[PDB]
Amino acid sequence: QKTPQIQVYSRHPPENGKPNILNCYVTQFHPPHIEIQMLKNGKKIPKVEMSDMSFSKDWSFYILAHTEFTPTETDTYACRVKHASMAEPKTVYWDRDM
Amino acid sequence: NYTFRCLQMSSFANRSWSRTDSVVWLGDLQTHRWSNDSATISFTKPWSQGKLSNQQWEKLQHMFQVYRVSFTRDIQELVKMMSPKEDYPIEIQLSAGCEMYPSESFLHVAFQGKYVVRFWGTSWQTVPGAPSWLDLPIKVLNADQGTSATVQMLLNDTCPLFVRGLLEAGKSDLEKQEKPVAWLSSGHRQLVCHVSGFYPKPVWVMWMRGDQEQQGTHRGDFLPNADETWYLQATLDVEAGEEAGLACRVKHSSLGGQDIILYW
Numbered sequence: 001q002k003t004p005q006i007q008v009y010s011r012h013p014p015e016n017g018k019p020n021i022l023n024c025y026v027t028q029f030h031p032p033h034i035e036i037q038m039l040k041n042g043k044k045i046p047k048v049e050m051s052d053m054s055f056s057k058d059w060s061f062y063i064l065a066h067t068e069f070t071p072t073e074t075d076t077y078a079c080r081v082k083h084a085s086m087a088e089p090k091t092v093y094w095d096r097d098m
Numbered sequence: 099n100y101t102f103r104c105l106q107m108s109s110f111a112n113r114s115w116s117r118t119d120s121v122v123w124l125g126d127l128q129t130h131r132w133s134n135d136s137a138t139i140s141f142t143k144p145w146s147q148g149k150l151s152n153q154q155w156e157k158l159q160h161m162f163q164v165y166r167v168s169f170t171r172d173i174q175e176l177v178k179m180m181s182p183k184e185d186y187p188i189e190i191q192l193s194a195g196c197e198m199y200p201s202e203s204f205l206h207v208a209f210q211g212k213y214v215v216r217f218w219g220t221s222w223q224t225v226p227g228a229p230s231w232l233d234l235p236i237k238v239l240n241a242d243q244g245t246s247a248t249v250q251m252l253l254n255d256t257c258p259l260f261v262r263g264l265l266e267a268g269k270s271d272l273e274k275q276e277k278p279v280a281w282l283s284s285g286h287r288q289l290v291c292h293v294s295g296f297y298p299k300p301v302w303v304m305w306m307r308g309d310q311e312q313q314g315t316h317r318g319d320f321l322p323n324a325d326e327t328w329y330l331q332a333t334l335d336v337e338a339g340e341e342a343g344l345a346c347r348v349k350h351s352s353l354g355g356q357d358i359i360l361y362w
């Protein structure tokens with residue numbers, strides 16, 4: 001049983017008011033059953049697209065979530081992950097730079 | 099040097115619930131998807147059929163269809179036989195395909211996240227350290243001559259031939275060039291150079307002062323974008339004041355020899 005690593009980064013340079021894409025890359029987990037949400041100001045974003053689940057040479061799973069977003073300096077963004085390996089959801093906030 | 103990988107993931111939750119899902123990669127591009135939901139293998143590219151005719155493709159698909167049902171049945175029946183010593187839930191993963199050179203093939207299987215079985219030569223075999231209760235089922239599997247013959251054909255012959263067809267039919271996607279965009283951001287201070295949207299994967303990203311490479315540059319992991327391009331960052335730890343004069347330099351095949359230089 002292995003704990004998911006979470007990385008949150010933007011497709012294009014984050015400029016306030018310009019539409020962009022936010023990525024949440026979740027890796028190094030086992031078993032494969034996992035729940036992944038992306039959050040804007042703590043609330044679940046509805047239209048989040050998901051890649052097919054796959055796995056690496058070391059057999060650990062990975063998956064990529066993404067959604068449209070427009071960064072501003074009044075909005076936070078996060079990726080929240082529920083998985084058997086952790087007692088509660090793990091949330092990683094977007095760094096605002098990544 | 100392209101590696102073709104068919105990745106199968108099977109979760110068995112209890113005697114009444116399981117699913118098997120597959121994805122197929124040529125290098126770092128997904129060529130196929132096969133969901134438990136679907137009877138047919140879905141194409142994730144317009145060239146995912148390679149050079150195979152419609153009927154040849156249909157034959158190959160049919161065999162995998164039969165396989166998927168047989169595999170699920172075999173695993174369930176094996177668990178009944180071993181019960182209660184081997185208990186649900188069970189995760190099985192298969193990684194199979196071929197690495198093309200100017201080829202070699204592999205078929206690796208893992209149980210609960212650990213590599214346990216391969217096909218090699220003419221037979222299935224447990225790997226050193228695998229649980230000993232696998233030995234009997236593998237011996238029985240090895241008695242099945244038709245399966246052994248089919249697997250040998252698939253690995254030795256079908257895989258390399260299929261893949262040479264994919265390399266031809268997918269040439270413009272496989273050889274696509276996508277230009278990165280870069281940007282900078284940041285006791286000491288950590289300077290971050292972000293590089294996103296590049297394809298193919300090979301890239302060079304360095305903090306510079308004039309023409310001098312700053313050896314403290316720490317390259318991060320390659321992270322995928324959702325549009326089949328790559329993301330990477332390179333960080334440099336500096337003290338205050340020092341930030342003047344520094345730049346991030348990016349080289350990539352798509353840039354026609356015109357590097358990106360970003361001055362802090």
Ligand SMILES: *[C@@H]1O[C@H](CO[C@@H]2O[C@@H](C)[C@@H](O)[C@@H](O)[C@@H]2O)[C@@H](O[C@@H]2O[C@H](CO)[C@@H](O[C@@H]3O[C@H](CO[C@H]4O[C@H](CO)[C@@H](O)[C@H](O)[C@@H]4O)[C@@H](O)[C@H](O[C@H]4O[C@H](CO)[C@@H](O)[C@H](O)[C@@H]4O)[C@@H]3O)[C@H](O)[C@H]2NC(C)=O)[C@H](O)[C@H]1NC(C)=O
Pocket residue numbers: 201202203204205217218219220250251253254
């Ligand atoms: C498909 O290719 C197989 C080889 O390729 C590897 O496996 C495949 C699945 C891919 O992963 C690929 O990437 C790999 O590189 C090929 O397997 C080979 O099959 C032949 C027989 O069909 C085997 O030959 C027999 O070898 C044994 C000895 O094996 C041991 O020693 C050798 C080194 O000396 C090692 O390589 C082995 O690993 C073992 O340690 C002999 O004892 C035997 O001789 C006896 O039998 C012959 C008749 O077959 C008689 O005439 C003789 O007098 C003897 O009585 C064979 O010569 C070969 O070992 C096996 N390779 C491996 C690595 O096991 C497979 O046949 C291909 N199938 C098709 C349909 O194309």
Ligand SMILES: CCCCCCCCCCCCCCCCCCCC(=O)N[C@@H](CO[C@H]1O[C@H](CO)[C@H](O)[C@H](O)[C@H]1O)[C@H](O)[C@H](O)CCCC(=O)NCCCCCCc1ccccc1
Pocket residue numbers: 104120122130139158161162164165168169172176190194195205207208209214215222232235239242243244245248249252253256257260
């Ligand atoms: C997806 C894109 C693909 C594009 C194509 C590119 C080519 C890639 C080629 C590489 C892919 C490798 C595929 C490997 C699996 C293929 C197996 C094909 C053979 C097959 O069906 N056999 C079943 C059909 O059975 C009947 O007919 C055959 C004749 O064809 C026999 O004569 C047999 O007697 C008859 O029953 C068999 O039923 C067979 O048993 C299928 C299941 C066996 C199997 O493959 N099991 C999984 C491998 C064993 C490892 C499990 C080990 C394990 C792990 C964890 C816990 C316990 C055990």
Ligand SMILES: *[C@@H]1O[C@H](CO)[C@@H](O)[C@H](O)[C@H]1NC(C)=O
Pocket residue numbers: 111112114115
């Ligand atoms: C079997 O597992 C599935 C998924 O874990 C679950 O929905 C269901 O409760 C289980 N069913 C039985 C009969 O145990």
Ligand SMILES: *[C@@H]1O[C@H](CO)[C@@H](O)[C@H](O)[C@H]1NC(C)=O
Pocket residue numbers: 115116117118134135
């Ligand atoms: C997976 O597909 C098989 C074959 O159609 C089906 O019987 C099974 O219920 C599916 N599993 C799930 C969890 O949907």
Ligand code: NA
Pocket residue numbers: 029030058059060061210211212
């Ligand atoms: Na794993």
Ligand code: NA
Pocket residue numbers: 059189190191208209210211212
């Ligand atoms: Na596994």
